Design a protein around this nucleic acid. Sequence first.
RNA 1: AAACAUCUCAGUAUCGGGAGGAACAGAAAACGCAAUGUGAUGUCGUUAGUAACCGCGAGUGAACGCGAUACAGCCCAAACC
RNA 2: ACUCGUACGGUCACUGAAUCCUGCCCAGUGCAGGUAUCUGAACACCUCGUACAAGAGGACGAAGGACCUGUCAACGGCGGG
RNA 3: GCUUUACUGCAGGCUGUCGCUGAGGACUCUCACUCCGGGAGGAGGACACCGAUAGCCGGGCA
Lengths: 56, 92, 237, 194
Amino acid sequence: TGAGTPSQGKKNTTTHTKCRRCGEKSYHTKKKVCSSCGFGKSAKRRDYEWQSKAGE
Amino acid sequence: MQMPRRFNTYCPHCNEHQEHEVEKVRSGRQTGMKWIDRQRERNSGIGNDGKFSKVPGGDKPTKKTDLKYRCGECGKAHLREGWRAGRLEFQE
Amino acid sequence: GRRIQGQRRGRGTSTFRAPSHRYKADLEHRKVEDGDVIAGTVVDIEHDPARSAPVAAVEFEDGDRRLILAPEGVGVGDELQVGVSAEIAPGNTLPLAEIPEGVPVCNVESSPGDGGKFARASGVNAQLLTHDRNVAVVKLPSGEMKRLDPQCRATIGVVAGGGRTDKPFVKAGNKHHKMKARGTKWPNVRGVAMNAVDHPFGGGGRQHPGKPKSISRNAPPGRKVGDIASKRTGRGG
Amino acid sequence: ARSAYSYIRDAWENPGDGQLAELQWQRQQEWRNEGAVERIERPTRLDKARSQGYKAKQGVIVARVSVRKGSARKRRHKAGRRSKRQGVTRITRRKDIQRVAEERASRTFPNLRVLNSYSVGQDGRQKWHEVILIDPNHPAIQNDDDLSWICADDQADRVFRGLTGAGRRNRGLSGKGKGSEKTRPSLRSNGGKA
RNA sequence: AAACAUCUCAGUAUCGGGAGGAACAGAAAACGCAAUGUGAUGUCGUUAGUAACCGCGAGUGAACGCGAUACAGCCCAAACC
RNA sequence: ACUCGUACGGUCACUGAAUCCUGCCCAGUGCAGGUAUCUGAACACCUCGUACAAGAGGACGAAGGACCUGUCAACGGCGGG
RNA sequence: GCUUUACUGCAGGCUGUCGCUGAGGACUCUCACUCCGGGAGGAGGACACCGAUAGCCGGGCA
Ligand SMILES: [Cl-]
Ligand SMILES: [Cl-]
Ligand SMILES: [Cl-]
Ligand SMILES: [Cl-]
Ligand SMILES: [K+]
Ligand SMILES: [Mg+2]
Ligand SMILES: [Mg+2]
Ligand SMILES: [Mg+2]
Ligand SMILES: [Mg+2]
Ligand SMILES: [Mg+2]
Ligand SMILES: [Mg+2]
Ligand SMILES: [Mg+2]
Ligand SMILES: [Mg+2]
Ligand SMILES: [Mg+2]
Ligand SMILES: [Mg+2]
Ligand SMILES: [Mg+2]
Ligand SMILES: [Mg+2]
Ligand SMILES: [Mg+2]
Ligand SMILES: [Mg+2]
Ligand SMILES: [Mg+2]
Ligand SMILES: [Mg+2]
Ligand SMILES: [Mg+2]
Ligand code: NA
Ligand code: NA
Ligand code: NA
Ligand code: NA
Ligand code: NA
Ligand code: NA
Ligand code: NA
Ligand code: NA
Ligand code: NA
Ligand code: NA
Ligand code: NA
C-alpha cells in the first residue's frame, strides 16, 4: 500500500480541537493538551524565545 | 670516534690555553616547579588537554655531541657546538 | 550506532512487559501469628498463566480464600496445614527445622516469612540435607548447596506439572502462544543477521561475528552480548 | 561575662566532639526519617539564629532542609560535543547546597521570604541546614523596626534572585577590592564570568 | 584557528526560576599613583588593546588612578539590663 | 522492566526440522581461573628538602599486566618442503 | 552513516583510598547504616549503600 494518497483515507480521527483557553484549534483531545498555549500541561502560557529572531 | 679525555685548548674564562677534561653532559633532575609545570596542572582538565595531550617525538638516526669542557686550573666548564657522531668513546 | 535490543528491554515498554493484568495470584506462604492451628481445604485446581502449571484454590478456617503453589499429589477435598506443628505430608508448609531430612521440598523461603522464593517451577524441588540449630543445608534444583535459616518455611513435595519440557513445541505457533503470556519479546533475530549499526555482531558480507563471542564482565551495556564472561565454551575438553 | 549563647557557639565549632557529637548521632537518626523540608518550633543553634536576625516572635519561622551531598546530577550529552564538553562525573553546580536548601524551603512556604540560613551538620550522603523565613504580611513583623524591611515589595522572592546572604557570598560579592571585577554589581552585567 | 583536539564562536543561542518601574550594587577584614596618600555603590569618559592569558598559534583581555554624573548614610548579634 | 516470575527459570548469543554425523589445533586474539617472583595509582607512613609549602626519594602494594592453566557447538586455522 | 589493536576523550564495570564509621596482618562485637518480618522481632553490620578520589578495562558513546 502506498504511503501517499492510499494512506490518506483512514484519516477520520479527531485530535487537535478548539482550545478552551487560547481559542486555537490545537487542543489535542486525546492528550488533553494544547500544542499552542500549553493549556493542560502548564499553568503558564506556552512561549519560547525561538518564536522570533534572536535579536528581536 | 675516539676522543681524548684531556687535552690543551683555549679556556674562555681564564683567557689562556690550558688542559681541559671532556665529560658527557649528564642530565640534571627536574624540580617540577617551573612555570611550565604549573601550567600543566592548571590548564589540564575535562577532555583533551591541548599541548599537554601530546606525546614524545621521534629520533634522529645520529645525535650530536653533548660535551662539557672542564678547565684544569680554574675548574670552570664551558660548552661548544657539538657534531653528529654515531658513538663517542674517551681515551684514558 | 543505535541501542541494541537488550537496552530497549530495560525501558519496560509494553512489548517487553508481562501481561500482569492477566496473572492470577502472587503465590506466597501465609502469615500465621504462631501456634500453627491454621489449616484449610483444597477447593479447586487452577492453571497459573504465569507459570504454565497448576495452582490450588484453598479455603482456610478463618474465612481466607487464597490460591497456592500446588505440589504434585493434591486434589479437591484434601486438607492442607501450615505452621510449626503442621503434619509432615505433601501440600503442607513448615520450617525446614520441623522437616525430616531426605524429604523433597518446594517453594522454599530465602529469608523466613518472605513467602517462598526457591524451587517453584514445574516439576522441580529442593532437597533438605543437613540439620542444625543455625543452618539447614538445602540442595536447590540447580545442584547448589544453599545454607539456610532453619526458620525458613517450605512446602513438602515436588512442584506440580512435572515433565513439561519433555514434549517439543513442534511448531512456531505453540511457542507464539506461550511467549504471549510472559515478559519476553519473541521471535528472536540473530545479532549476526543485523546491520553493524544495530548489534556488535552486525554487518559483513556474510554472517559471522566480528570479534570473538566471549565478552568481559566489565563490558558496558550496548556491548555485553554473545557469551557473557564464559569460563569456557564448546563441549570438548 | 560569657553569654549562655556563647556556649552553643563554642559547642558547634566542633560538631564531632563532646556532647554535640552524641547529640548529632542521635538527632540525625530522626532527621533521616523526616521529610525534605521540616518546620521546627525552635532553632537548633540559637546563637546562630539570633545572630542571623532571628527573634522568638510572631511571623518568624525556621525549617530544616536536607539536600544530597556531592557534584552535579548531570545527564550525559545526547548529541555532538567537543571533548571539553563531554564531561559528566566531574561537573559541579555553581550554587552551593546551602543555597539549594534555602530555595527548597522558600518554595515550601510561598508566602514567606528567606531571611537567612545556617548549617546543622551532615552524614555520609546529605547535609542539613535550618532556614529562617519571615511572614512579611504579619503585623508583628510589619511593625518590627529590625525586620520590617523584608516587607517591601522589592524583597519578593529574594532567595530566587540571590539576594540572600549565602546568595551574595556565592555570587563572589564578599571582597570589595581585587578579585571582584567580574562579580559586582552583578554576574549578569559582567557577562557571566565567575 | 585557512585541517583540528586546548583555544575560539561564548557564558553567545536556547532552556529553568523570579523582582521592579527600574533592577542589581553599596558604607571597606577597600585601595596600595607606597603615601605626611584616597575614602560606600553604580554609571559615562579615559587609563588600554596597557598588565595578564594563549598548540605563547589564532586569538583573548582587566584593574588601581584620573576627569565627570549623582551623592548618604545607617540597623542588628553580644557585653550590661 | 524482567517479575502476580525463581534454574522444568530467564537472560545473552550461535546454529536452524527429522535422519547419519560433527575430525585435528589453545601458537596469536577473546573470555575465565591461578600465580613464587616481576610490574602496578592515589591516601596514609618513613627520608631529604622548606622555621611551613611546593618538590625529590623510599617502604607497602589492589584490580590489571608479565608468567601458568582451562576453553574452539570462542574469533579463527587445517600449508611448504 | 559505519568500523577498528587510528588520534583524543566520555560513560560504564572492576579495584585501592577518604567520608558516613562505632566498641573490643588476623579476629570479636553492636549502636549507626541495609534488608526480612504486621509486629515482637530476625538477618546483615562498620562492611554494604551513598558521596569523593586514584589505577585498570573501556568504539557502549562523542
Ligand atoms: Cl656525547
Ligand atoms: Cl520458552
Ligand atoms: Cl525568598
Ligand atoms: Cl589613591
Ligand atoms: K569547536
Ligand atoms: Mg513516510
Ligand atoms: Mg584532560
Ligand atoms: Mg512474587
Ligand atoms: Mg529448548
Ligand atoms: Mg508480550
Ligand atoms: Mg533466530
Ligand atoms: Mg541485511
Ligand atoms: Mg558497533
Ligand atoms: Mg550461516
Ligand atoms: Mg555463521
Ligand atoms: Mg547594572
Ligand atoms: Mg577551522
Ligand atoms: Mg595554526
Ligand atoms: Mg573570553
Ligand atoms: Mg586594583
Ligand atoms: Mg524493601
Ligand atoms: Mg566514531
Ligand atoms: Na585557574
Ligand atoms: Na557481521
Ligand atoms: Na517564598
Ligand atoms: Na571566573
Ligand atoms: Na579553515
Ligand atoms: Na574539516
Ligand atoms: Na590555549
Ligand atoms: Na595622580
Ligand atoms: Na590458540
Ligand atoms: Na588461548
Ligand atoms: Na551517510
